[PDB]
Design a protein around this ligand. Structure first.
Ligand code: FAD
Length: 453
């Protein structure tokens, strides 16, 4: 167990009660460095380990699609942990108040959480630190290389971050030890009831079409740790060989489809990398996929961790801010409202089809995601307005949304973060431009449009 994966958030006097794993980002029982570290500390203190999850008040800012996907996975997780004699407690409310009250009530000895660089997690940590007196640790269970270890600062390009991460792969890319069960079972409602009341509160804002029927199709991605593994095995067996050649074709389902599972932590990216590394397939396709799940995924954590304003115009590179400022008063070809973007009511049938794939499946193809967000910049009054629209639609309708990959991917599309300058155009400036005709020369756009009416 590498001690570089864990960071001390607050020192204190250890109690003689159970070690509490405040699970948040990595919702799985296998391949969880945060849970394994909590079990190790619990063994050293001759005390059990308990898992606590907070059902926050911000779930009404998303949809049923993300709520059901997460809760149905937690229902499976509660059974997995129970077989390991590890009890799980699901609290409903503010983590600042609920975690502090749980620590005091259950006489917790040590508190551990997983790592997320998002602003809301730091808000919770701030509130929790003020209300506890026991040691508080956080463990990076999401990245193969701990975020604070891969680089000590913001990396402006993938080619500067790539050698740093690969140089540390031999140390941190390793197999997971088995989660040892608790010795004996130790000493706040049913998840089915919380799901029922939550869905009932979300129903008025459910995405519907004109026929009052729901837009979202839940059968595309089955939630849970077991289903995530089957998706990974199917990708390695059937799709990895062609990934390098077809990853930019939205008419082919050749991606791994792992992001909903990766976002909620229902599968470990380190586990996926281990299995891909030992798989025998096209070297170009393996290089391409590993570049996505290692370099681009973990550089997104790098971006949010080292840029407090990661969701703002101020985090854009200087060349992009100056370029976009120089074209602020350029006349835009079209100006669409947030409601027109949301309903897919633009003059662009390819953009509208991309929005329909997002509305119906909750996972837009990676290539059209780049086109989808760049057109928001082109058809908005300002770069700041384009950021708000793209973030709003991304976090509301993507299953993989509200994620460092989302803010870093949007910042790449609109602000050229982790990109270079291109030819100077009006409105968009030197930001990389993606044209409708350019897409037509890349893939069968007519089939993609016809698929998502
Ligand atoms: C405008 C925009 C919005 C995006 N919104 C999200 C989002 O809300 N949530 C999200 O997790 N990702 C987002 N991405 C990144 C990327 O599109 C998705 O991660 C990827 O498409 C998810 O589907 P997949 O698992 O089948 O991809 P795969 O090709 O099978 O890659 C596997 C994993 O590698 C990672 N990965 C792949 N591509 C990227 C990438 N471009 N950036 C960062 N990580 C990557 C992902 O974790 C991904 O799950 C967005 C990108 C853009 C340009």
């Amino acid at each position: 167990m590498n001690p570089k994966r864990i960071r001390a958030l607050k020192s204190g006097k250890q109690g003689d009660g159970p070690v509490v794993y405040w699970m948040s980002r990595d919702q799985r029982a296998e391949d969880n460095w945060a849970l394994l570290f909590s079990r190790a500390i619990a063994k050293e203190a001759n005390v059990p380990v308990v898992v606590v999850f907070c059902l926050t008040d911000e779930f009404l800012e998303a949809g049923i699609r993300q709520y059901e996907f997460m809760l149905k996975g937690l229902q499976e997780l509660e059974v997995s942990l129970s077989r390991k004699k590890i009890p799980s407690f699901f609290l409903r409310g503010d983590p600042g108040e609920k975690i502090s009250r749980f620590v005091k009530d259950y006489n917790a000895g040590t508190l551990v959480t997983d790592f997320s660089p998002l602003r809301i997690k730091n808000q919770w940590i701030e509130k929790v630190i003020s209300g506890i007196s026991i040691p508080f640790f956080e463990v990076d269970a999401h990245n193969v290389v701990p975020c604070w270890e891969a680089s000590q600062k913001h990396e402006y390009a993938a080619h500067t971050f790539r050698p740093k991460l690969y140089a540390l792969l031999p140390e941190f890319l390793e197999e997971f030890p088995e989660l040892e069960p608790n010795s004996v079972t130790p000493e706040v409602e049913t998840l089915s009831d919380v799901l029922e009341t939550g869905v009932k509160a979300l129903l008025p804002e459910r995405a519907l079409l004109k026929n009052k029927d729901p837009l979202f199709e839940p059968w595309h991605f089955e939630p849970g740790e077991k289903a995530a593994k089957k998706v990974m095995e199917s990708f390695i067996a059937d799709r990895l060989d062609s990934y390098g050649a077809l990853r930019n074709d939205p008419t082919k389902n050749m991606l791994s489809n792992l992001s909903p599972y990766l976002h909620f932590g229902q599968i470990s990216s380190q586990r996926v990398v281990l299995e891909v590394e030992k798989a025998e397939s096209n070297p170009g396709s393996k290089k391409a996929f590993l570049d996505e799940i290692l370099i681009w995924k973990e550089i997104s954590d790098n971006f949010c961790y080292y840029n407090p304003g990661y969701d703002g115009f101020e985090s854009f590179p200087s060349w992009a801010k100056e370029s976009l400022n120089a074209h602020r008063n350029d006349v835009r070809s079209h100006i669409y409202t947030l409601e027109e973007f949301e309903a897919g009511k633009t003059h662009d049938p390819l953009w509208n089809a991309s929005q329909m794939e997002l509305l119906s499946t909750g996972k837009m193809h990676g290539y059209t995601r780049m086109y989808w967000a760049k057109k928001i910049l082109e058809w908005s009054e300002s770069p700041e307005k384009a950021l708000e629209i793209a973030i709003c639609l991304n976090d509301r309708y993507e299953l993989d949304g509200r994620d460092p990959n989302g803010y870093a991917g949007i910042a790449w599309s609109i602000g050229g973060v982790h990109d270079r300058a291109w030819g100077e155009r009006e409105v968009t400036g030197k930001i990389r431009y993606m044209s409708y005709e350019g897409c037509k020369r890349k893939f069968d756009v007519k089939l993609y449009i016809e698929k998502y009416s």
